[PDB]
Amino acid sequence: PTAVQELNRICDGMILSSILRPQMVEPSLIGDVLKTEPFTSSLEVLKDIKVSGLMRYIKQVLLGRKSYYKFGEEHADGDQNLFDYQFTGTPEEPIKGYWTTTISYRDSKPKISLTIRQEFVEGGVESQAVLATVVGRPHLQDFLLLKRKHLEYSDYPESIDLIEFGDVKVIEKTVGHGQPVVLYMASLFPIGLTKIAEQGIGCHNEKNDATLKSLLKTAILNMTPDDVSLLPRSKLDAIDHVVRNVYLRFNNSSAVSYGLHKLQSFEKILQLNGRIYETKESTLVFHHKKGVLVEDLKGLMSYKTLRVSEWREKQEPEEARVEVLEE
Amino acid sequence: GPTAVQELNRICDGMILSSILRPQMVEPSLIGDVLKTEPFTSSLEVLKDIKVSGLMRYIKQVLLGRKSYYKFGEEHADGDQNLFDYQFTGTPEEPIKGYWTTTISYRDSKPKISLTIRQEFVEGGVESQAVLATVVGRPHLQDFLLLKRKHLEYSDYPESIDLIEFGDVKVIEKTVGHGQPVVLYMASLFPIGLTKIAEQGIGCHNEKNDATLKSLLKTAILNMTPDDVSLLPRSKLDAIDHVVRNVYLRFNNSSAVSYGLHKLQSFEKILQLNGRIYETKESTLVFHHKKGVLVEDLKGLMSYKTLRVSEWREKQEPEEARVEVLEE
Ligand SMILES: [Cl-]
């Protein structure tokens, strides 16, 4: 592998060790991971690799950092003249009548962004804007700059220009003040705070992908329903972060045979975190009465207004009865 | 009245709309005829400083007196190879239809020189497909290695991107035009002397242009006989496909059916040549010549090119009232 791959593997090893074992993010954790995932490139090449998050913390420890990771040390205003564009559908090609665009300041952490969700409804456009930002920012001034970038990048700027700051929902994140953090279930728990900071789960290679799936199930299998009832909300939310990332990796059949949803203690997770999970293929509902359900516009059941039907594994005698149509 | 750009927008809308019934060479008389019903309010002095591209610029230039017709390739620009544009649809934490895709390109390049990396979760991790959209004669490998470093630096150096070798990349080389005049027909440019087309943004997002587009399409197909359709070049059929698909994305399933384009002889001959599966605003329909109108349905007892479908039916309340509300 390369230095990039090695850095990835060390980061995967920490994420993976956090599934069963909370650990303080400090140099000896990286030292202990290095036993299984050594770093064999030279420190000089490491300096050319520009990273953030735990990747960058690992990089710094390999370069000699001895201090523990401090919550909020990555805070960046960003470049207020460089912008990232995220889009979900377009005006030319909406997704089920919707298109969403998020423009953000490049390299801001927490990210400062204006998201505008839009929809064609008789006989105009309905817009919803959310400014996700940080306490103390100049919210009206950030909205206007970002709105201007929305007008310049939009294939339909007429619908944007009428959105006023009074219509915007604001969400403010706070920067940490250097608290040390515990890594557990791919999430940072800053000492003294009650919230968590979910971390990205890599595990893009064969071994780490399979071990991620197996450790999640092992984590849940080793909790009784009463254990789960005793978990604080912050730990429930971190578990939710790993659970949802794992289900995104499965199609419907693989998610079902994975069988996490069959564990008695996972049913307690479902009651506390929700029953609705996105897979690679679609949306499933792990229902306690009806079993596995699959989102289905033509379904004859509704779970919290989502129409669903019973999910069914493909069976060769049934597939053989499907009428294959002439083209 | 509307600003100088909203004016251009409406004039461009008007050209696209005029291209539905007949092909139109892109030349000043086309613009002038559009100005009869969509007149340009603002002063030409404002218009001098607006930054536009594509057809909206050619409209601008014609407003400023240009007598020459539009020339294919006249917009070529190698772009700024020190400055980069960054967009993405989907992320590893919220994939869109199972994928996430990132595109990084050279600022102001036309054709756009870009590296797109699309990824999905598969067994054993992540699969990637990379596409370098570029121009004949570029240094493809150097562009790739430059844009790949950007991707790594933009994505927090995921191991899956670093694994992508130049030999894994699909290279799509666009041709630059050579000054050919161009015909606009069904929202697509046909450069004379070339066999390819360039689909254009269709626009028409206001209420009146939406309805006009829908009306003009049905009329354009009505104006054709089945024999007419069987004589059209593949170029013209692809342009028609462009407009048909944009229109069905504007309907829910019920409105798509009462729109009734699918019921026309000449459209059935179109279906035979472009396919029967059309995404709508609501789901997906199959306009079948034997079974009738079908609708995507994972429970379907029929499959059309592997899509499971059922027969379409109007929403009724005695099916609705029986929907079982589930315990939370
Ligand atoms: Cl058939």
Side-chain angles (χ1 to χ4, degrees), chain A residues 2 4-5 8-9 50-52 84-87 91-92 96 106 123 158 204-206 248 275 280 287-288 290 295-296 298 300-304 307 319 323 325-327, chain B residues 86-89 93 98 120-121 124-126 153 156-157 159-160 162-163 202-203 205 207 246 276 281-282 288 291 297 299 301-305 308 320 324 326-328:
Chain A
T2 65
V4 169
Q5 286 163 226
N8 275 264
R9 306 319 219 292
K50 111 180 168 170
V51 279
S52 60
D84 305 329
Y85 296 77
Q86 172 172 9
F87 61 104
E92 291 286 303
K96 292 221 201 288
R106 171 96 32 88
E158 290 83 341
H204 279 6
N205 62 74
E206 226 184 72
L248 286 177
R275 291 190 185 280
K280 187 192 178 355
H287 195 264
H288 55 304
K290 310 281 183 171
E295 105 191 295
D296 179 2
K298 312 278 300 288
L300 295 186
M301 314 185 259
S302 63
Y303 184 82
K304 307 176 72 74
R307 300 263 214 95
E319 296 293 86
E323 180 169 16
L325 297 180
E326 225 61 53
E327 300 192 359
Chain B
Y86 298 72
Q87 68 178 34
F88 59 101
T89 301
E93 302 203 338
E120 69 183 289
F121 288 123
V126 166
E153 286 178 355
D156 205 15
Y157 275 83
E159 130 173 52
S160 54
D162 183 35
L163 298 176
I202 289 184
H205 298 130
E207 203 186 302
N246 181 281
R276 302 182 177 279
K281 169 209 261 188
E282 181 169 7
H288 202 256
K291 302 283 174 164
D297 183 351
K299 299 177 312 312
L301 310 151
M302 316 185 240
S303 78
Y304 183 84
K305 299 181 168 161
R308 295 298 166 84
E320 292 283 309
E324 189 179 355
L326 293 189
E327 199 182 287
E328 312 193 337

XYZ file of all heavy atoms in Angstrom, chain A residues 2 4-5 8-9 50-52 84-87 91-92 96 106 123 158 204-206 248 275 280 287-288 290 295-296 298 300-304 307 319 323 325-327, chain B residues 86-89 93 98 120-121 124-126 153 156-157 159-160 162-163 202-203 205 207 246 276 281-282 288 291 297 299 301-305 308 320 324 326-328:
710
model
N 0.186 2.409 -0.082
C 0.840 3.704 -0.033
C 0.678 4.325 1.359
O 0.052 3.761 2.262
C 0.261 4.611 -1.121
O -1.122 4.862 -0.825
C 0.391 3.941 -2.508
N -1.108 6.930 1.912
C -2.541 7.233 1.970
C -3.327 6.021 2.439
O -4.211 6.122 3.300
C -3.049 7.713 0.597
C -4.577 7.762 0.580
C -2.470 9.064 0.261
N -3.036 4.857 1.858
C -3.741 3.654 2.268
C -3.422 3.304 3.710
O -4.317 2.909 4.468
C -3.407 2.501 1.331
C -4.084 2.635 -0.023
C -3.465 1.743 -1.084
O -3.204 2.186 -2.209
N -3.221 0.483 -0.730
N -5.302 5.533 6.073
C -6.672 5.020 6.084
C -6.815 3.818 7.004
O -7.774 3.728 7.778
C -7.113 4.628 4.677
C -7.653 5.780 3.896
O -8.873 5.993 3.832
N -6.755 6.537 3.274
N -5.892 2.863 6.901
C -6.011 1.645 7.693
C -5.863 1.935 9.176
O -6.504 1.287 10.007
C -4.959 0.622 7.279
C -4.911 0.270 5.815
C -6.278 0.120 5.204
N -6.307 -0.998 4.258
C -5.669 -1.026 3.092
N -4.932 0.004 2.696
N -5.784 -2.088 2.306
N -2.547 16.281 2.782
C -3.372 17.261 3.478
C -4.664 16.556 3.882
O -5.401 16.047 3.026
C -3.604 18.501 2.603
C -4.996 18.761 2.063
C -5.066 20.047 1.200
C -6.332 20.117 0.479
N -6.664 21.368 -0.222
N -4.910 16.472 5.192
C -6.032 15.712 5.727
C -6.681 16.509 6.848
O -6.166 17.538 7.290
C -5.592 14.318 6.205
C -5.487 13.373 5.019
C -4.266 14.410 6.951
N -7.849 16.037 7.282
C -8.543 16.604 8.429
C -9.014 15.449 9.305
O -8.671 14.284 9.072
C -9.701 17.522 8.002
O -10.679 16.854 7.225
N -18.266 25.283 -2.171
C -18.586 23.918 -2.560
C -20.059 23.842 -2.944
O -20.908 24.514 -2.335
C -18.261 22.939 -1.423
C -16.799 23.047 -0.944
O -15.901 23.378 -1.751
O -16.550 22.817 0.255
N -20.364 23.044 -3.970
C -21.727 22.935 -4.479
C -22.217 21.501 -4.322
O -21.634 20.578 -4.896
C -21.802 23.377 -5.940
C -21.465 24.834 -6.151
C -20.140 25.268 -6.129
C -22.470 25.780 -6.362
C -19.827 26.604 -6.314
C -22.165 27.119 -6.562
C -20.841 27.520 -6.528
O -20.528 28.840 -6.711
N -23.283 21.309 -3.548
C -23.919 20.005 -3.413
C -25.326 20.110 -3.977
O -26.077 21.036 -3.617
C -23.947 19.532 -1.958
C -24.785 18.268 -1.745
C -24.650 17.691 -0.349
O -24.055 18.307 0.541
N -25.223 16.514 -0.142
N -25.687 19.190 -4.878
C -27.030 19.248 -5.450
C -27.671 17.873 -5.446
O -26.993 16.846 -5.562
C -27.059 19.868 -6.879
C -26.258 19.110 -7.914
C -26.886 18.305 -8.858
C -24.883 19.260 -7.980
C -26.149 17.631 -9.830
C -24.137 18.589 -8.937
C -24.768 17.777 -9.864
N -33.493 21.683 -11.532
C -34.733 22.152 -12.176
C -35.020 21.473 -13.503
O -36.194 21.241 -13.813
C -34.496 23.659 -12.345
C -33.533 23.996 -11.284
C -32.616 22.812 -11.173
N -33.986 21.159 -14.301
C -34.192 20.349 -15.506
C -34.651 18.934 -15.164
O -35.497 18.367 -15.869
C -32.915 20.290 -16.354
C -32.533 21.609 -17.006
C -33.437 21.965 -18.172
O -33.538 21.156 -19.116
O -34.056 23.049 -18.139
N -38.588 13.497 -7.989
C -39.957 13.471 -7.479
C -40.470 14.885 -7.214
O -41.124 15.162 -6.209
C -40.072 12.578 -6.236
C -39.871 11.064 -6.518
C -40.878 10.199 -5.729
C -40.426 8.734 -5.566
N -40.483 7.919 -6.818
N -15.837 26.917 1.393
C -14.793 25.899 1.320
C -13.986 25.840 2.608
O -13.526 26.862 3.124
C -13.867 26.187 0.142
C -12.591 25.326 0.080
C -12.755 24.129 -0.842
N -13.655 24.411 -1.950
C -13.284 24.946 -3.112
N -12.009 25.248 -3.336
N -14.198 25.171 -4.057
N -49.245 26.755 -8.705
C -48.631 26.733 -10.019
C -47.307 27.477 -10.021
O -46.977 28.201 -10.970
N -35.080 33.003 -10.732
C -36.276 33.752 -10.347
C -36.838 33.252 -9.018
O -37.307 34.043 -8.191
C -37.340 33.641 -11.442
C -37.028 34.370 -12.746
C -36.140 33.571 -13.700
O -35.453 32.608 -13.267
O -36.127 33.916 -14.901
N -13.158 1.109 3.599
C -13.444 0.926 2.190
C -12.787 -0.316 1.597
O -13.101 -0.665 0.452
C -13.009 2.171 1.414
C -14.016 3.289 1.476
N -15.151 3.223 2.275
C -14.066 4.472 0.832
C -15.858 4.323 2.134
N -15.219 5.099 1.262
N -11.948 -1.018 2.352
C -11.310 -2.221 1.845
C -12.024 -3.460 2.378
O -12.880 -3.390 3.266
C -9.831 -2.253 2.213
C -9.607 -2.277 3.699
O -9.819 -3.297 4.353
N -9.193 -1.144 4.251
N -11.632 -4.612 1.816
C -12.334 -5.875 2.030
C -12.368 -6.263 3.502
O -13.418 -6.648 4.031
C -11.647 -6.972 1.209
C -12.540 -7.893 0.401
C -11.731 -9.002 -0.299
O -11.248 -9.917 0.401
O -11.548 -8.938 -1.533
N -26.502 1.250 5.007
C -26.284 1.860 3.697
C -25.439 0.975 2.782
O -25.493 1.140 1.559
C -25.597 3.219 3.847
C -26.473 4.371 4.358
C -25.671 5.662 4.552
C -27.602 4.580 3.382
N -37.430 3.031 13.540
C -37.571 1.777 12.827
C -37.206 1.866 11.357
O -37.180 0.830 10.680
C -38.998 1.256 12.978
C -39.318 0.812 14.387
C -40.647 0.084 14.488
N -40.941 -0.204 15.891
C -40.424 -1.219 16.572
N -39.577 -2.066 15.979
N -40.744 -1.377 17.849
N -28.682 0.430 0.689
C -28.226 0.746 -0.657
C -29.381 0.709 -1.651
O -29.411 1.497 -2.607
C -27.118 -0.231 -1.065
C -26.451 0.094 -2.380
C -25.594 -1.070 -2.850
C -24.963 -0.749 -4.194
N -25.455 0.565 -4.749
N -40.227 -3.613 11.490
C -41.440 -3.511 12.286
C -41.553 -4.681 13.247
O -41.278 -5.829 12.885
C -42.691 -3.451 11.412
C -43.903 -2.994 12.159
N -44.819 -3.870 12.696
C -44.337 -1.749 12.480
C -45.776 -3.185 13.297
N -45.509 -1.897 13.176
N -41.978 -4.379 14.478
C -42.049 -5.400 15.520
C -43.229 -6.352 15.349
O -43.152 -7.494 15.815
C -42.115 -4.748 16.899
C -43.235 -3.768 17.046
N -43.397 -2.687 16.203
C -44.235 -3.688 17.956
C -44.456 -1.994 16.578
N -44.978 -2.577 17.642
N -45.012 -6.758 12.047
C -45.128 -7.230 10.677
C -43.808 -7.713 10.093
O -43.801 -8.247 8.980
C -45.694 -6.112 9.804
C -46.957 -5.471 10.373
C -48.184 -6.333 10.120
C -49.459 -5.655 10.621
N -50.664 -6.410 10.185
N -40.270 0.267 1.610
C -41.054 1.385 1.115
C -41.635 1.009 -0.237
O -40.974 0.372 -1.058
C -40.203 2.658 1.020
C -39.798 3.051 -0.373
C -38.754 4.141 -0.372
O -39.080 5.263 0.075
O -37.604 3.854 -0.802
N -42.904 1.356 -0.433
C -43.664 0.878 -1.583
C -44.831 1.856 -1.757
O -45.798 1.814 -0.992
C -44.137 -0.556 -1.348
C -44.968 -1.121 -2.513
O -45.162 -0.431 -3.538
O -45.418 -2.282 -2.409
N -47.072 1.744 -3.792
C -48.272 0.944 -3.981
C -48.584 0.052 -2.782
O -49.473 -0.796 -2.881
C -48.132 0.084 -5.237
C -47.638 0.838 -6.461
C -48.753 1.583 -7.158
C -49.845 0.629 -7.623
N -49.391 -0.196 -8.778
N -49.911 -1.411 0.882
C -51.208 -1.335 1.548
C -51.070 -1.121 3.051
O -52.037 -1.309 3.800
C -52.037 -2.588 1.253
C -52.470 -2.803 -0.200
C -53.402 -4.005 -0.299
C -53.147 -1.543 -0.763
N -49.886 -0.735 3.507
C -49.678 -0.376 4.899
C -48.962 0.970 4.983
O -48.338 1.406 4.017
C -48.874 -1.446 5.625
C -49.331 -2.857 5.362
S -48.325 -4.108 6.481
C -47.036 -4.799 5.213
N -49.044 1.607 6.149
C -48.405 2.899 6.373
C -47.727 2.893 7.733
O -48.335 2.547 8.748
C -49.405 4.054 6.265
O -50.383 3.926 7.270
N -46.440 3.218 7.734
C -45.674 3.367 8.961
C -45.305 4.837 9.043
O -44.474 5.320 8.260
C -44.430 2.482 8.993
C -43.711 2.597 10.325
C -44.134 1.876 11.433
C -42.668 3.481 10.490
C -43.496 2.014 12.646
C -42.031 3.618 11.704
C -42.457 2.895 12.774
O -41.809 3.048 13.985
N -45.947 5.546 9.966
C -45.727 6.975 10.131
C -45.820 7.693 8.786
O -44.965 8.505 8.432
C -44.390 7.232 10.824
C -44.271 6.452 12.131
C -42.900 6.633 12.784
C -42.726 8.014 13.389
N -43.527 8.121 14.637
N -45.779 4.650 2.986
C -46.424 3.449 2.493
C -45.379 2.389 2.225
O -44.337 2.671 1.608
C -47.267 3.743 1.264
C -48.361 4.769 1.580
C -49.683 4.111 1.887
N -50.759 4.898 1.426
C -51.284 4.660 0.234
N -50.837 3.665 -0.558
N -52.291 5.413 -0.177
N -40.171 -15.959 -9.122
C -39.554 -15.294 -10.258
C -39.925 -15.972 -11.571
O -40.056 -15.308 -12.599
C -38.034 -15.290 -10.076
C -37.561 -14.486 -8.884
C -37.824 -12.998 -9.058
O -38.940 -12.528 -8.729
O -36.908 -12.297 -9.527
N -44.422 -12.510 -15.507
C -44.594 -12.385 -16.950
C -43.551 -11.437 -17.527
O -43.629 -10.221 -17.332
C -46.005 -11.900 -17.269
C -46.259 -11.740 -18.740
C -47.723 -11.510 -19.048
O -48.482 -11.173 -18.122
O -48.115 -11.659 -20.226
N -42.306 -9.234 -20.254
C -43.028 -8.544 -21.315
C -42.208 -8.426 -22.593
O -40.978 -8.357 -22.574
C -43.436 -7.135 -20.876
C -44.402 -7.115 -19.709
C -44.751 -5.682 -19.336
C -45.637 -7.933 -20.055
N -42.918 -8.369 -23.714
C -42.300 -8.004 -24.984
C -41.833 -6.550 -24.941
O -42.506 -5.678 -24.386
C -43.303 -8.209 -26.123
C -42.727 -8.910 -27.326
C -42.227 -10.312 -26.997
O -42.998 -11.112 -26.431
O -41.052 -10.607 -27.291
N -40.679 -6.279 -25.537
C -40.157 -4.913 -25.485
C -40.904 -3.950 -26.415
O -40.904 -2.741 -26.202
C -38.666 -4.924 -25.803
C -37.918 -5.770 -24.791
C -36.413 -5.617 -24.852
O -35.904 -4.849 -25.704
O -35.745 -6.279 -24.035
N -15.933 22.612 -7.913
C -16.178 21.443 -7.080
C -17.682 21.285 -6.921
O -18.343 22.185 -6.374
C -15.525 21.600 -5.703
C -14.009 21.726 -5.660
C -13.364 22.891 -6.091
C -13.220 20.692 -5.147
C -11.981 23.012 -6.037
C -11.842 20.804 -5.083
C -11.226 21.962 -5.531
O -9.855 22.062 -5.466
N -18.228 20.161 -7.400
C -19.613 19.824 -7.111
C -19.739 18.340 -6.816
O -18.899 17.526 -7.223
C -20.544 20.220 -8.251
C -20.379 19.432 -9.511
C -21.372 19.874 -10.554
O -21.731 21.060 -10.621
N -21.862 18.921 -11.351
N -20.807 17.992 -6.097
C -21.059 16.598 -5.784
C -22.549 16.382 -5.555
O -23.275 17.293 -5.159
C -20.218 16.118 -4.590
C -20.439 16.890 -3.297
C -21.248 16.369 -2.299
C -19.778 18.077 -3.054
C -21.438 17.054 -1.097
C -19.967 18.780 -1.843
C -20.791 18.253 -0.865
N -23.000 15.175 -5.871
C -24.368 14.723 -5.638
C -24.278 13.412 -4.884
O -23.711 12.440 -5.400
C -25.133 14.511 -6.945
O -25.160 15.726 -7.687
C -26.556 14.052 -6.664
N -22.336 9.169 3.331
C -23.334 9.118 4.398
C -24.759 9.390 3.933
O -25.697 9.035 4.655
C -22.962 10.091 5.525
C -21.576 9.798 6.103
C -21.382 10.320 7.505
O -22.111 11.245 7.916
O -20.496 9.791 8.206
N -28.233 5.090 -4.499
C -27.212 4.092 -4.265
C -25.794 4.529 -4.548
O -24.867 3.733 -4.341
N -19.917 3.503 -5.061
C -21.018 2.811 -4.401
C -20.463 1.769 -3.438
O -19.344 1.277 -3.603
C -21.959 2.144 -5.406
C -21.356 0.959 -6.149
C -22.318 0.382 -7.193
O -23.328 -0.237 -6.809
O -22.071 0.570 -8.399
N -21.251 1.454 -2.418
C -20.932 0.340 -1.543
C -21.216 -0.966 -2.277
O -22.288 -1.134 -2.868
C -21.749 0.411 -0.251
C -21.322 1.503 0.671
C -22.228 2.473 1.098
C -20.022 1.560 1.131
C -21.822 3.478 1.968
C -19.611 2.565 1.998
C -20.508 3.522 2.411
N -17.252 -6.292 0.048
C -15.822 -6.041 0.101
C -15.424 -4.585 0.071
O -14.224 -4.286 -0.017
N -16.384 -3.666 0.118
C -16.050 -2.267 0.295
C -16.718 -1.317 -0.675
O -17.950 -1.228 -0.725
N -15.908 -0.591 -1.444
C -16.374 0.467 -2.335
C -15.868 0.200 -3.749
O -14.676 -0.044 -3.955
C -15.900 1.852 -1.857
C -16.097 2.885 -2.950
C -16.655 2.269 -0.594
N -7.503 15.371 -1.987
C -7.445 16.497 -1.071
C -8.823 17.002 -0.699
O -9.007 17.551 0.392
C -6.626 17.625 -1.691
C -5.153 17.331 -1.680
C -4.350 18.410 -2.341
O -4.986 19.335 -2.881
O -3.102 18.343 -2.305
N -10.738 14.040 1.873
C -9.959 13.574 3.018
C -9.214 12.290 2.665
O -9.113 11.373 3.481
C -10.820 13.389 4.272
C -10.019 13.497 5.558
O -8.865 13.985 5.506
O -10.555 13.101 6.624
N -8.681 12.240 1.446
C -7.821 11.154 0.988
C -8.400 9.770 1.295
O -7.788 8.991 2.035
C -6.434 11.290 1.600
C -5.477 12.210 0.872
C -5.494 13.586 1.085
C -4.529 11.695 -0.002
C -4.600 14.417 0.425
C -3.632 12.516 -0.657
C -3.674 13.866 -0.447
O -2.777 14.672 -1.112
N -9.002 5.931 0.777
C -8.173 4.915 0.151
C -8.751 4.465 -1.197
O -7.993 4.118 -2.115
C -8.012 3.762 1.145
C -8.294 2.400 0.619
C -7.936 1.322 1.624
O -8.378 1.398 2.790
O -7.203 0.406 1.239
N -10.081 4.507 -1.343
C -10.726 4.055 -2.570
C -10.399 4.948 -3.760
O -10.300 4.446 -4.880
C -12.238 3.967 -2.378
O -12.765 5.198 -1.910
N -7.506 6.737 -3.985
C -6.084 6.575 -4.261
C -5.816 5.332 -5.093
O -4.840 5.306 -5.852
C -5.290 6.535 -2.957
C -3.785 6.431 -3.196
O -3.301 7.022 -4.187
O -3.096 5.747 -2.412
N -6.684 4.308 -4.989
C -6.547 3.060 -5.743
C -6.877 3.193 -7.227
O -6.656 2.233 -7.974
C -7.454 1.975 -5.147
C -7.170 1.575 -3.697
C -8.178 0.557 -3.161
C -5.749 1.048 -3.591
N -33.749 23.083 -21.259
C -35.059 23.358 -21.824
C -35.737 24.557 -21.158
O -36.487 25.287 -21.819
C -35.902 22.075 -21.729
C -35.357 21.039 -22.735
C -37.406 22.360 -21.866
C -36.135 19.752 -22.820
N -35.454 24.796 -19.881
C -36.044 25.941 -19.202
C -37.529 25.754 -19.001
O -37.995 24.697 -18.545
N -39.773 26.998 -16.903
C -40.180 26.638 -15.552
C -41.322 27.492 -15.011
O -41.904 27.134 -13.983
C -38.967 26.697 -14.625
C -37.897 25.727 -15.012
N -36.572 26.085 -15.149
C -37.966 24.415 -15.330
C -35.869 25.029 -15.522
N -36.691 24.001 -15.636
N -45.251 28.948 -15.208
C -46.496 28.231 -15.427
C -46.907 28.257 -16.893
O -47.328 27.231 -17.446
C -47.580 28.846 -14.544
C -48.741 27.941 -14.240
C -49.833 28.670 -13.487
O -49.548 29.207 -12.388
O -50.967 28.727 -14.012
N -38.065 15.286 -20.361
C -38.219 16.489 -19.542
C -39.687 16.757 -19.221
O -40.028 17.177 -18.109
C -37.582 17.666 -20.276
C -37.660 18.972 -19.506
O -38.701 19.631 -19.492
N -36.535 19.380 -18.902
N -39.895 2.591 -23.865
C -41.219 2.750 -23.279
C -41.202 3.182 -21.822
O -42.261 3.526 -21.297
C -42.018 1.439 -23.406
C -42.156 0.969 -24.863
C -42.977 -0.312 -25.031
N -43.113 -0.647 -26.448
C -44.004 -0.099 -27.267
N -44.872 0.800 -26.816
N -44.037 -0.462 -28.537
N -42.716 12.559 -12.301
C -42.534 13.202 -11.011
C -42.959 12.278 -9.869
O -42.460 12.410 -8.746
C -43.311 14.524 -11.004
C -43.462 15.208 -9.678
C -44.744 16.024 -9.650
C -44.494 17.487 -9.921
N -45.747 18.264 -9.692
N -43.850 11.320 -10.139
C -44.391 10.461 -9.092
C -43.633 9.144 -8.986
O -43.214 8.752 -7.892
C -45.880 10.195 -9.341
C -46.537 9.320 -8.287
C -48.035 9.303 -8.419
O -48.552 9.860 -9.410
O -48.708 8.745 -7.529
N -46.909 0.645 -22.645
C -46.789 -0.625 -23.355
C -47.831 -0.758 -24.458
O -48.987 -0.363 -24.290
C -46.908 -1.813 -22.398
C -46.291 -3.065 -22.943
N -47.038 -4.101 -23.458
C -44.996 -3.415 -23.103
C -46.226 -5.056 -23.882
N -44.981 -4.666 -23.676
N -49.971 -4.298 -23.160
C -50.569 -4.287 -21.833
C -51.206 -2.956 -21.456
O -51.998 -2.913 -20.503
C -49.511 -4.658 -20.787
C -48.881 -6.021 -21.046
C -49.807 -7.155 -20.626
C -49.202 -8.495 -21.031
N -49.829 -9.654 -20.348
N -43.806 -1.093 -9.789
C -44.441 -1.733 -8.647
C -43.552 -2.902 -8.260
O -43.435 -3.862 -9.021
C -45.848 -2.183 -9.007
C -46.594 -2.787 -7.841
O -45.990 -3.033 -6.772
O -47.799 -3.024 -8.004
N -44.129 -5.135 -6.327
C -44.960 -6.324 -6.215
C -45.432 -6.844 -7.572
O -46.242 -7.776 -7.621
C -46.164 -6.029 -5.318
C -45.789 -5.618 -3.889
C -47.011 -5.247 -3.034
C -47.942 -4.285 -3.754
N -47.183 -3.149 -4.362
N -46.365 -8.467 -11.078
C -46.285 -9.771 -11.721
C -45.757 -9.694 -13.148
O -45.710 -10.716 -13.840
C -47.660 -10.442 -11.706
C -48.321 -10.457 -10.327
C -49.849 -10.451 -10.449
C -47.839 -11.629 -9.517
N -45.339 -8.520 -13.598
C -44.805 -8.401 -14.940
C -43.504 -7.667 -14.839
O -43.328 -6.838 -13.956
C -45.749 -7.619 -15.816
C -47.192 -7.988 -15.674
S -48.172 -6.945 -17.019
C -49.440 -5.860 -16.004
N -42.585 -7.956 -15.743
C -41.357 -7.192 -15.810
C -41.173 -6.698 -17.236
O -41.429 -7.428 -18.200
C -40.154 -8.020 -15.351
O -39.760 -8.904 -16.364
N -40.770 -5.442 -17.362
C -40.440 -4.841 -18.646
C -38.983 -4.422 -18.557
O -38.645 -3.517 -17.788
C -41.346 -3.645 -18.973
C -41.028 -3.079 -20.337
C -41.591 -3.630 -21.491
C -40.125 -2.032 -20.480
C -41.269 -3.134 -22.757
C -39.801 -1.536 -21.733
C -40.370 -2.091 -22.861
O -40.034 -1.580 -24.086
N -38.127 -5.077 -19.339
C -36.678 -4.862 -19.270
C -36.198 -4.863 -17.816
O -35.442 -3.996 -17.377
C -36.282 -3.571 -19.989
C -36.628 -3.556 -21.490
C -36.178 -2.258 -22.121
C -36.235 -2.321 -23.628
N -36.234 -0.967 -24.211
N -40.034 -4.309 -12.559
C -41.302 -4.903 -12.151
C -42.416 -3.877 -12.243
O -42.320 -2.786 -11.672
C -41.218 -5.431 -10.724
C -40.246 -6.576 -10.553
C -40.662 -7.790 -11.378
N -39.564 -8.745 -11.463
C -39.310 -9.650 -10.528
N -40.089 -9.716 -9.448
N -38.286 -10.483 -10.671
N -57.707 3.112 -0.780
C -57.058 3.953 0.226
C -57.576 3.658 1.632
O -56.789 3.501 2.572
C -57.267 5.436 -0.108
C -56.546 5.908 -1.349
C -55.084 6.111 -1.093
O -54.733 6.797 -0.131
O -54.272 5.611 -1.869
N -53.573 -0.111 5.941
C -53.431 -0.445 7.354
C -52.431 0.506 8.004
O -51.231 0.468 7.701
C -52.991 -1.898 7.502
C -53.019 -2.421 8.912
C -52.586 -3.879 8.986
O -52.361 -4.484 7.920
O -52.462 -4.412 10.104
N -50.018 1.349 10.741
C -49.243 0.463 11.597
C -48.894 1.133 12.912
O -48.630 2.338 12.964
C -47.943 0.022 10.900
C -48.171 -0.875 9.693
C -46.872 -1.446 9.191
C -49.147 -2.006 10.104
N -48.853 0.321 13.962
C -48.325 0.741 15.253
C -46.878 1.209 15.116
O -46.055 0.577 14.439
C -48.420 -0.431 16.227
C -48.338 -0.102 17.699
C -48.403 -1.364 18.548
O -49.509 -1.945 18.640
O -47.353 -1.782 19.096
N -46.564 2.321 15.770
C -45.209 2.860 15.720
C -44.196 1.983 16.432
O -43.035 1.897 15.993
C -45.172 4.269 16.324
C -46.264 5.153 15.802
C -46.060 6.622 16.138
O -45.345 6.938 17.113
O -46.616 7.460 15.408
